[PDB]
């Protein structure tokens, strides 16, 4: 019964080798890299601001205001997972589905 | 007597400083942590200048407190003060401390302190006798903390012979001591001993001998950054002579990075001078920034003119630098590597020819490279398209060279290859930085619910169940 339930959310073998649409993959890469462009600009400000910040404001002043460092990591994590999988799956498909 | 008052005021504080370091050495043995020795040797360059003849005498006769053969050895080699008014008896050892012999950890330090000043007074013959007497002391002993002291002693032991211009009798001592350090896994001594041997070999142009040693011996990974800097320079110099330019450039760049950030100007100059040649010997272009630094501007000027000559890729300007700064390069130990730059001047000159001309006459190529005859340019271009320097073809009957149409660089694997070495290096920095994150040994699970405060809820919750339900 445990192995049977492990089939929940188990994707089909087609999806593993399925390549994401390259037009949208570049567009997603386009958008997120642009998002980090503003975040990097804000990240510089956060470094100088936190240099002159009392230790009581390390968390209170971060409440309600977006953290450039936190979103930068999420954008980096998403892009590197997205591109590595797209590259690896593409490289696998070039030999697996080979006409020769 | 204003000078005497100030000097004596400066003398006593130095004596306290020497007293401070020894207690770190003694507490290193007491605590059984050899790393405590480093803070005494951390200030060793500072104290080396802050000591005079009077400073030495008070320490040597005031710290031993036992008139063994040691006090009969180093006292006669230093001048003694007269019957000063402030006869402050500097005796850190009292009672049983005075009777007990000094530790081999500490007695090596003062003896090294003596041998440093004998170098500053240019008493190399007298310094040699003291250093030779010193090296009997550490050779016999087998302590673990003394090895950290021993590494500094070996450095100055090669230094006293450096000013004696022998440098050969130390090779047997350095090699023998290296095995003693290697078999004991003395990382600090082994790193210094290997560096001193390479300097020994390179001083006599024993580049073959030094290459063999670095091929078999393994430099300590857990070595001082100052010893890593010397090793990377010495290895890089070896590789440059052995036509291993690519590995040479990486090492000297690493040696520059590990060099001290505010001192060791002379070492930066020497490494910069060799790295400029290697980068030119590798076909790359030296960074323009390094010639702008105040410390390197005057020293790198002959190499700045040489870099300019190589960059334009004309034999005429390259030879002018050689005929103008040949003596400077010879005294700099870089003349022989400069001579090979003539091939790079031709190579980069041909590279600009193909990069700019779709079809150029061989007589013209001889003019742009200032070669002898177009027949000579015919052979020179012939290898360049064989070695892959330029992509072109020669029409012997017509007499020109036809450069190949440039291929789309972004449509091949080269951008991936360039990114791969950049991506893997960034991923290496992150792993290196994460592994360097240290957590202090704070009392964990103490920020949880306190025993007394958690007990408050249970009693209050009991009344909540005993009253609301009823």
């Amino acid at each position: 019964e445990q192995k049977m339930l492990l089939n929940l959310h188990k994707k089909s073998w087609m999806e593993g080798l399925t390549l994401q649409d390259y037009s949208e993959h570049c567009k997603h890469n386009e958008s997120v890299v642009k998002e980090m462009l503003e975040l990097a600009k804000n990240y510089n400000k956060a470094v100088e601001e936190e240099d002159k910040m009392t230790p009581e404001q390390l968390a209170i002043k971060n409440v309600g205001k977006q953290d450039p460092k936190r979103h930068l990591e999420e954008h980096v994590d998403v892009l590197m997972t997205s591109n590595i999988v797209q590259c690896l799956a593409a490289m696998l498909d070039t030999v697996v589905f080979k006409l020769i | 007597a204003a000078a005497e008052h100030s000097q004596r005021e400066l003398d006593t504080v130095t004596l306290e400083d020497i007293k401070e370091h020894v207690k770190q050495l003694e507490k290193a043995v007491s605590g059984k942590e050899p790393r405590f020795v480093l803070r005494a040797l951390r200030m060793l360059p500072s104290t080396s200048r802050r000591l005079n003849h009077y400073v030495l005498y008070k320490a040597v006769q005031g710290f031993f407190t036992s008139n063994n053969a040691t006090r009969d050895f180093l006292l006669p080699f230093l001048e003694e003060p007269m019957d000063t008014e402030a006869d402050l008896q500097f005796r850190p050892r009292t009672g049983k401390a005075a009777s007990t012999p000094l530790l081999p950890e500490v007695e090596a330090y003062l003896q090294l302190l003596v041998v440093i000043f004998m170098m500053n007074s240019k008493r190399y013959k007298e310094a040699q006798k003291i250093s030779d007497d010193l090296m009997q002391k550490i050779s016999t002993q087998n302590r673990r903390a003394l090895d950290l002291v021993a590494a500094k002693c070996y450095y100055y032991h090669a230094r006293v012979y450096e000013f004696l211009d022998k440098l050969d009798v130390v090779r047997s001592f350095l090699h023998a001591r290296l095995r003693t350090a290697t078999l004991r896994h003395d990382a600090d001594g082994q790193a210094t001993l290997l560096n001193l041997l390479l300097r020994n070999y390179l001083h006599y142009s024993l580049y073959d001998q030094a290459e063999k040693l670095v091929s078999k011996s393994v430099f300590p990974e857990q070595a001082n950054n100052n010893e890593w800097a010397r090793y990377l320079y010495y290895t890089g110099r070896i590789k440059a002579i052995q036509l291993e330019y690519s590995e040479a450039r990486r090492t000297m760049t690493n040696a520059l990075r590990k060099a001290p950030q505010h001192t060791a100007v002379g070492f930066k100059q020497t490494v910069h001078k060799l790295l400029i040649v290697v980068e030119l010997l590798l076909g790359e272009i030296p960074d323009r920034l390094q010639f702008r630094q105040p410390s390197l501007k005057r020293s790198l000027m002959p190499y700045f003119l040489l870099t300019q000559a190589v960059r334009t890729g004309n034999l005429a300007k390259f030879n002018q630098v050689l005929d103008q700064f040949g003596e400077k390069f010879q005294a700099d130990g870089t003349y022989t590597l400069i001579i090979r730059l003539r091939h790079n001047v031709i190579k980069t000159g041909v590279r600009m020819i193909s990069l700019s001309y779709s079809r150029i006459s061989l007589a013209d190529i001889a003019q742009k490279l200032q070669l002898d005859s177009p027949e000579d340019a015919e052979f020179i271009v012939a290898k360049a398209i064989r070695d892959g320097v330029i992509e072109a073809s020669i029409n012997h009957e017509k007499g020109y060279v036809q450069s190949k149409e440039m291929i789309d660089i972004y449509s091949t694997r080269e951008p991936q290859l360039a990114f791969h070495q950049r991506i893997s290096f960034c991923l290496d920095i992150h792993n290196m930085s994460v592994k360097a994150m240290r957590f202090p040994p704070k009392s964990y699970n103490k920020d949880l619910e306190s025993a007394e405060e958690r007990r408050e809820r249970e009693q209050q919750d009991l009344e909540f169940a005993k009253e609301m339900a009823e």
């Binding site: 590197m80 590595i84 590259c87 690896l88 490289m91 696998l92 070039t94 030999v95 | 090979r340 003539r342 091939h343 031709i346 190579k347 005859s373 027949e375 000579d376 015919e378 052979f379 020179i380 271009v381 012939a382 290898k383 360049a384 398209i385 064989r386 073809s393 020669i394 012997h396 009957e397 091949t412 694997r413 991936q416 791969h420 991506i423 893997s424 991923l427 290496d428 792993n431 994460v434």
Partner: protein, 116 residues
Amino acid sequence: YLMEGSYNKVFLAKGNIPAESYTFFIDILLDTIRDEIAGCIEKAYEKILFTEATRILFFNTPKKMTDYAKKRGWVLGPNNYYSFASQQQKPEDTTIPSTELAKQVIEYARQLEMIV
């Protein structure tokens, strides 16, 4: 001269040797130079004339080309030209190194997840 390709001066080095003792090692070098010069020609010249390569290879008699030609396997043309069509063996960008690239991209994922 050998490194920069001044093969003209390498053969001219015979005449201006410093002493009579140096002769032996010069000929040993000159045998290596002969293959090195022709090694350029295959990748340099797309076709070079018969007696045109006589001075390039520093061959005295035309017969000394014939034995060297078959040793190097040079297909002589009817117009006294050697056809060196061999650049077709390009670096072979026709093939994507999928296994090598897949090996590298996997290593990136390892350096991101294996760290823990």
